[PDB]
Amino acid sequence: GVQVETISPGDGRTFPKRGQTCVVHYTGMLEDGKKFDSSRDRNKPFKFMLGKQEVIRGWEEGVAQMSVGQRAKLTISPDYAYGATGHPGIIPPHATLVFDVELLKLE
Amino acid sequence: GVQVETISPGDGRTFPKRGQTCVVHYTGMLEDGKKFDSSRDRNKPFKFMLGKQEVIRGWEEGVAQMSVGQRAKLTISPDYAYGATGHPGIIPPHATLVFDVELLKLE
Numbered sequence A, B: 001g002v003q004v005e006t007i008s009p010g011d012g013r014t015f016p017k018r019g020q021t022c023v024v025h026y027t028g029m030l031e032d033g034k035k036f037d038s039s040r041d042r043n044k045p046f047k048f049m050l051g052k053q054e055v056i057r058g059w060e061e062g063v064a065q066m067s068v069g070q071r072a073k074l075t076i077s078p079d080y081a082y083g084a085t086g087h088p089g090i091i092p093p094h095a096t097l098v099f100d101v102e103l104l105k106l107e
């Protein structure tokens, strides 16, 4: 499933609804902290909409639990991410993923 | 995992090794038989190599158990395919996939 652990609290009242665009910054890491990707390194937020199979399920369920301005660590089991296959040449088979996500705005 | 059920036997001696190119024809279906893709409909075999995260894990383990000329049904659990996310706009969350695969040749 997905576990959400809060680094900095959000506003406690504006939570993502389907059809809104979530604007986020993220750093993706393996369980030992090794970074494989980051939008912060590109200085460009990532945007996506809930409800459209646009992101791995771990993100669809984890970001829905965050309010605007919150920064959280999402730990996602392989079945809610790339499972037994992994993602070619970046993520191994059976990997639990850790994302540092900041929900900046809803559009 | 992956279950392999044989429709027509292969030669019983030439099995795929890593670094060989497998040439196949396939039809992918949901568990109720609804077709979502087929190389046979495009009249063009699909080619891939074992060992390179080029296909879902269910195929890497299932085709390794087939010999040249064999036609088999591969039933693949969601964790060995697209898990809880699915594949956007084609495959739902938590779907077991059935592939009719024919191993035509190894290159």
Ligand SMILES: C=CC[C@@H]1/C=C(\C)C[C@H](C)C[C@H](OC)[C@H]2O[C@@](O)(C(=O)C(=O)N3CCCC[C@H]3C(=O)O[C@H](/C(C)=C/[C@@H]3CC[C@@H](O)[C@H](OC)C3)[C@H](C)[C@@H](O)CC1=O)[C@H](C)C[C@@H]2OC
Pocket: A026, A028, A036, A037, A046, A053, A054, A055, A056, A059, A081, A082, A087, A090, A091, B081, B082, B083, B085, B086, B087, B088
């Ligand atoms: C159309 C092609 C390019 C298109 C690319 C972008 C818009 C640029 C965007 C910043 C992605 C990154 O590009 C630098 C890069 O992000 C990762 O590094 C990563 O951190 C990650 O895991 N993320 C990204 C941030 C949201 C969560 C997750 C994801 O859900 O990502 C999604 C993903 C890969 C899901 C698959 C989709 C197929 C399903 O079958 C499978 O389901 C099992 C899950 C991405 C957003 C796709 O929806 C759309 C894309 O692919 C991947 C390790 C590899 C990925 O590059 C491809």
Ligand SMILES: C=CC[C@@H]1/C=C(\C)C[C@H](C)C[C@H](OC)[C@H]2O[C@@](O)(C(=O)C(=O)N3CCCC[C@H]3C(=O)O[C@H](/C(C)=C/[C@@H]3CC[C@@H](O)[C@H](OC)C3)[C@H](C)[C@@H](O)CC1=O)[C@H](C)C[C@@H]2OC
Pocket: A081, A082, A083, A085, A086, A087, A088, B026, B028, B036, B037, B046, B053, B054, B055, B056, B059, B081, B082, B087, B090, B091
């Ligand atoms: C570079 C982009 C285009 C590139 C496309 C081709 C060479 C054309 C090729 C005939 C694919 C089909 O195009 C008509 C189409 O085949 C499906 O319909 C399907 O029947 C299927 O399931 N197949 C295809 C036959 C082998 C098994 C499986 C697969 O393993 O496919 C792989 C797959 C999607 C794996 C993801 C990769 C990311 C991982 O993170 C994730 O791991 C959880 C698993 C394909 C071969 C990729 O390796 C490479 C591609 O994507 C998918 C439902 C959607 C897919 O279109 C994209």
